[model samples]
Target: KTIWQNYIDALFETFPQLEISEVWAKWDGGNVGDAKLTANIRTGEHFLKAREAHIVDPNSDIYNTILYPKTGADLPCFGMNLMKFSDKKVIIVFDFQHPREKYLFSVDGLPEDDGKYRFFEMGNHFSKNIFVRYCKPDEVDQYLDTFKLYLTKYKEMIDNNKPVGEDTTVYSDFDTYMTELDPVRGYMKNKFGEGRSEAFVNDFLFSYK
Candidate 1:
């Protein structure tokens, strides 16, 4: 139905073996009224979680995702940030969240470059495949078209994913960067308070321990 439901269904549609449950319930009710955090934590090495928040004061719908691989499989993070609100605005960030040699994403007729070199930068833990766009609510369908493509590709990658040596730096790097700078962190800080928000972020959201 909605994008959040779509994300959850699509995530488990093929890989139904993932052990999923709800975590981080403390991140809700203080200021945002109601929210949810559902996750699959079967392996201690990785985390796959989704967060949902609907703000009635501003009439906003916030759906987010965090799939970070801490160890075992050398998998990149699969993540997103979707906000449909502010009367006529929609912001979306869908990405694999890692680096690679070459990336391919030809979204129908859209240009191959994400704003050329001026806008897209690829380096450590970054890829050209990351999709970021701002459009109206009416244009979300087109974006979701690409979302399906990216998600399917990611799913296939994890389907045959192999194990890798545990790298301690991966978790520290990912958790620090994400917990401190990610856009959703700011959202949580405002609505859920700084201490508890960071606690959830470091303890559950980006937590590797």
Candidate 2:
């Protein structure tokens, strides 16, 4: 089945009370539920509704002082970027999906500590998309292996038509939903090959800004 169909089915399975119509994944709000949510407001398609639903006005004092400062402090602001693309209908993707700050880290497995540090600091780097954390160069192999395993496990659930759940940190339903999504993205990329939507990868970058 297509990804959208799979997503619709998963939503229903997770929330049986909601119908396909009611099941909305608000990209901006990080997946819509039963609420009156808007999808691609960035593209100016649903600009009106999205604006109307806006709670945190950019000009508001609370936003400038409290909300803005803390963002990008912990994560790379992928969440914010994704929200920006929600109005734009930007497709989402791995690695490239959030802020695409260019960092000079050696994805290769060899580097001195200073070199590694420089790699991280040079140019621009953000970890919001991949949940990336710095590791010793010698430990790169193990880290990649573990990351691959995690991705594979996630793919398995999607292939089996299982709900990956959400809010994995809390062990909520979020995990299931996320697991199902990886394959959907993989399949689409395979089918589309090159020239696919950079919007997917880049959506989170400017969206956060």
Candidate 3:
């Protein structure tokens, strides 16, 4: 599910405004290119940046996520990531991310979480309704269409988002990365250092403020 090709179509098919272009093609320097990075971002109304990485070291994997929803729009940014090692086990995740929000958000028309790949638990970050899917490689295609339902659903919410009249402070902001649960920062921190990891996030990854 990494580099979800369907995402772009499901996304632009339903957004509020402003077209986004790829601002950063690929970030390479260290990591022997084993850990490759690519991003699509030129910023605009309801736009920030979207990043994807394919890492091959301790494991072979890729994860892609976008920060859209613009600060003060009071909407949760969508998050999705997927990976498989040795073609053995697969870990996939998608959610309406609202790490710092005090109020939780919900999505309509999602199937019940049986146990393995249809639900989410209340977490320190993310919505109580997060969908974390873990399935075999063979099962990946089985639910690809289901993901679109989640994808298009957010866009429906996106269109309804409104800027705050006042107390804009109450609006939700893109993630500030919860270091402990963050895969992006944690890997970089171990490979580089806490400083560079944090710097990467500040200067590029979440590049707001």
Candidate 4:
């Protein structure tokens, strides 16, 4: 199966009730000959979405995948950026971010510390050998191991998401956390200018309505 197909299957297996809508298409003929997939997905109490792109060009090749939770739940986004350069050098980066800002807050029924610090614990749970490095073909299994761990943890969190009131400190902290993705916002601004940058972030990255 193709990369995007594997992704779609994994999502459905994890969230059997998820509703998926295709939100983007691809152009097979271009300077880069890209194949892209994007979807808006939702469950009873959660909203999720993703964009997967395989950029192909003799001059530059890249694989970028971003899966994020939009609203109704507070969970980290799953991001992966992999590139194979003209010289056949490969670079990979995969990470997930907690929804809270610098501090952790209590969810009503969940353990306070577990709700707050689960992601930090998850980061330490993986092997440090495979993340954010140039990986060889023989070492691809190492990358898969870490990716599986991330997906498992993410599924666990979203499955158990209990609604917290908008007025609560946790909600406020999540709002602030969104703004703190400034480096990304700034990069978009530089590439596409202010208005388009905001639109790109809202529609593509954050899935903000």
Candidate 5:
């Protein structure tokens, strides 16, 4: 866990538009990263402050949640949630976002409290390579474009009754379609340089093999 944490920590540390705000465990009553377990979690009114976030605004319905519903479920047990305090919020939400993109704007600010899955189950999968949370702050817009490209290609393939893993070449690697995906990777680099991300993804991809 520490190994992956440092890997992520280094990614955002170098990106100019992102900053690490807080790192704590979210618990579901069990030994999960319960925010209440240790002094490190609740020491300086951290839990109180988080609870206050829910109390301050009554309309903050579902505001206590950390990750998106699906992703949160994916990390049933103890999972890590990274928050980015961007100058602005990205309105249209998608399942995939840069690792450093802020989660504060989402209705479920973080993961849920009583979610069913345990930390072990959640850890099993995400601890693997290719798991993504928010994207780097500078890479937010580009990630969005990449997601758009994914959907456009998905639709085209569906319309033509194309097979899943067998493709010709319209959308091979990055966004080749003129859809929002067209230049997402380039845009990401324009915001946060490619060299670092290239290494990051490559290592993540080949780590298991």
Candidate 6:
């Protein structure tokens, strides 16, 4: 299995509460840049939507994964993007953001910040190997380890989430937070243009709603 597939499988194993729903959606009518784009989606009590995509371009291969939590769920969103260039170079970027906020804000002025859990740091940990001309076996192993750790951290956050009965002063504004989905649709529409982009964002990426 591909790294992206492995990660998704591990995510489901880590949180059995999640449910998978294969999106029979197509981007640009089933292909982008001479490559067939494929995607997987999941949702559950804790999550709003989790999307994973593999887009093979003529010049590069792209893997994208993102997990979005439900409103009122204090868990952070997880995102990872891996790009393999035609020249054999790789670029990997991953990060977890608390709720809908960019920089995790201080929770009611508490000394601890949610941003403390940094997945990007794990990505940076393997930056040297990723930037190299070739990936050694050990490097690949290290990447797998980091990815696992990242998911493990997310699992911890989910387990530690506040109970619904408890008052949540730091609750996310659902409407406002969801409004951000529009700009995303805008970007996809602009890049892929009309009909195709609509199907992509609505049917696959933001399939939760």
Best by TM-score: 1
Per-residue alpha-carbon lDDT of candidate 4 for residues 28-67, written as tens digits (9 for 90 to 100): 4333433322223343334444555454544334556655
Backbone clashes, candidate 2: 29
Q: Write the per-residue lDDT of candidate 1 for residues 1-209, one digit (tens) a residue.
A: 35445655665563455454543453344344654333334333234433322332244566666665444665776767677766588877777765222333232433243553222344334455656677876676666667777777777666667434556565566556555555555666676678866665666666653
Question: What is the Cα-based lDDT of residue 123 in candidate 2?
Answer: 25
TM-score of every candidate: 0.69, 0.20, 0.68, 0.52, 0.19, 0.59
**Candidate 6 positional error at 173, Å:** 9.1
Which whole-number lDDT from 0 to 100 does residue 152 have in model 4? 73
Question: Candidate 1 — which pairs collide?
Answer: none
Candidate 5 per-residue lDDT over residues 1-209, each given as its tens digit? 11123323332232222222343322122123221211011111111111101101111111111111111111111122223323232112222221121221111323222222322222112222212334444444444333334334323333344223312121212111112222223422433347633432232211111
Q: Sorted by lDDT, highest first, which candidate order results?
A: 1, 3, 6, 4, 2, 5
| Per-residue lDDT of model 3, residues 1-209, tens digit only | 34334444555555535354654445443465455455555444544444434444435455555544555655666777766554667777777776363555666577544243322335434665666676775666556777678767776675567433333232224344432235567666775567767766655556542
Q: Each prediction's Cα lDDT score?
A: 0.55, 0.24, 0.55, 0.47, 0.24, 0.52
Every model: Cα RMSD to truth = 5.0, 18.0, 4.7, 7.7, 20.2, 7.9
- Model 6: per-residue lDDT, tens digit, 58-158? 55556767676654555556666665655446655555544433433222211222232222322221221121123532243346556666677667666
Deviation in Å, model 6, residue 124 alpha carbon: 18
For TM-score, candidate 1 versus 4, the one ahead is 1
TM-score ranking of the models: 1, 3, 6, 4, 2, 5
Q: Which regions of candidate 3 deviate over 4 angstroms?
A: 1-3, 7-22, 29-32, 42-45, 48-59, 71-73, 112-124, 162-174, 189-196
The window of 10 residues in a row where model 2 has the poorest summed lDDT is: 60-69
* Segments in model 6 whose C-alpha atoms lie over 4 Å from true places: 1-5, 22-24, 27-33, 105-141, 162-194, 198-209
